[model samples]
Target: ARPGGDTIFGKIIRKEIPAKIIFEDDRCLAFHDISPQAPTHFLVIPKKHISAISVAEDDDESLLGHLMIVGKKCAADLGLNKGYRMVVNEGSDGGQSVYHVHLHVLGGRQMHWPPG
Candidate 1:
């Protein structure tokens, strides 16, 4: 959602409005939900926007690791050690609406299968 494009997430990345930010670094940012589905629902985004995992290359390895590590740390910080879910929605079929890649950190309750 890095702006200068037609991406729903762009508005979020640009801070056009407001989002509950939880963590941030020079290369990435993490925030709580404007609309949360769980007791702890948050998002992790890279400063450098990539539309999907399919578009990622070896160069993105570090970023990918960073994202996951951040997610894990976030979960622990929120006291979600028992269990949690980290999701990266892909293309349209994968429920990806935003053109930018993001990781969803969900926890603080029991999760179920067949998420549809």
Candidate 2:
């Protein structure tokens, strides 16, 4: 279950806050991170809040899967033809700061293996 309500993602989804959005549809929102880690770095999140991966229910299967496709499409749109990385941080120790589930799309550079 989600620990808090109305995360920053909720505000972004509602357009209550400003974000450099890349792609958007009925079920998901993709936007540029304010503090990007790579040359091409953005976040893909669901319209409906699901906290984290551990809390996702069976009904969230399609919605969760769609985010990956979105990430790939966005990466291609940005011309990350070589390679890219899709990351999902879970709990506090997993480096997740925001409660809302999000998929981080990073590319446009060499992403070393054995990520910390």
Candidate 3:
């Protein structure tokens, strides 16, 4: 897929599609992953259309940081006190199934060191 285009996350932002949203603010949105990988799994994404981390620009710094903080808040709200992992898959080789940039929050279970 191209770096810039309307993605499923874009639709969620527009409210054209439904998602299990957890947190929302002017800068970003947090929602549960439809196909969760762990007991605590969700996504935090910017309202702006950023294709991927590799495509992010300097001006996206604050927005990107805001996403991570929101992800932490959501994880804490979900009671993932033990620990959690935040991931941003870049391109095809990085296992990014969606083009829109998102922070994947996973926890509530053991996370291996070599995530692969």
Candidate 4:
């Protein structure tokens, strides 16, 4: 079940809190991270809150594809054509602080293997 109280990511999704927005469409929103690990760090999130990737069903394929495509476009738009990294944190062990599913885009520097 979805969490009852508002989530940190949800506030960014709802525009209840400020975010450095990078892109937006009817179904998704992309914005810069408040605490960035890389030179360019941003997140792409779905409007409809789905807790994790494990919960995504076949019906969500279209939305998933849309997010990926939009993410790629946003990355290129941000001058990350050379390369970039995309990640999704799931569950507690995966370091997911917020319940909502989100894609983390990291770039603007050389990335290493087995990222922390």
Q: What lDDT tens digits, residue by residue, belong to model 4 across residues 47-107? A: 8877789898888999888878988899999999779999888887788867777899999
| Candidate order (lDDT) | 2, 3, 4, 1
Cα RMSD for candidate 1? Answer: 2.2
Off by over 4 Å in 2: 1-5
lDDT string for model 1 (6-86, tens) is 465566667786787788888788899777899999989887878789999899999989999999998898899779988
Looking at model 2, residue 29 earns an lDDT score of 90
- True lDDT of residue 19, candidate 2: 96
Candidate 2 TM-score over all chains jointly: 0.93
| Model 3 C-alpha lDDT per residue in residues 24-86, reported as the tens digit of each score | 888888988999989988999888888789989999998988998888888989999899989
Q: TM-score of every model?
A: 0.86, 0.93, 0.92, 0.89
**Candidate 2 lDDT, 1-116, residue by residue in tens:** 23224888887887878998899999999999988999999999998888789999999999989999999999999999999999999997789989889999999899987877
> Which of the numbered candidates is closest to the native, going by highest lDDT?
2
Better of 2 and 4 by lDDT: 2
Name the regions of candidate 3 deviating beyond 4 angstroms: 1-5
Q: Tell me the lDDT of candidate 1.
A: 0.83
Top-down TM-score ranking? 2, 3, 4, 1
RMSD in Å for all candidates: 2.2, 2.7, 2.9, 2.5
Candidate topping TM-score? 2
Model 2 lowest lDDT segment of ten:
1-10
Q: Number of backbone collisions per candidate, in order?
A: 0, 0, 0, 0
lDDT of 1 at 89: 87
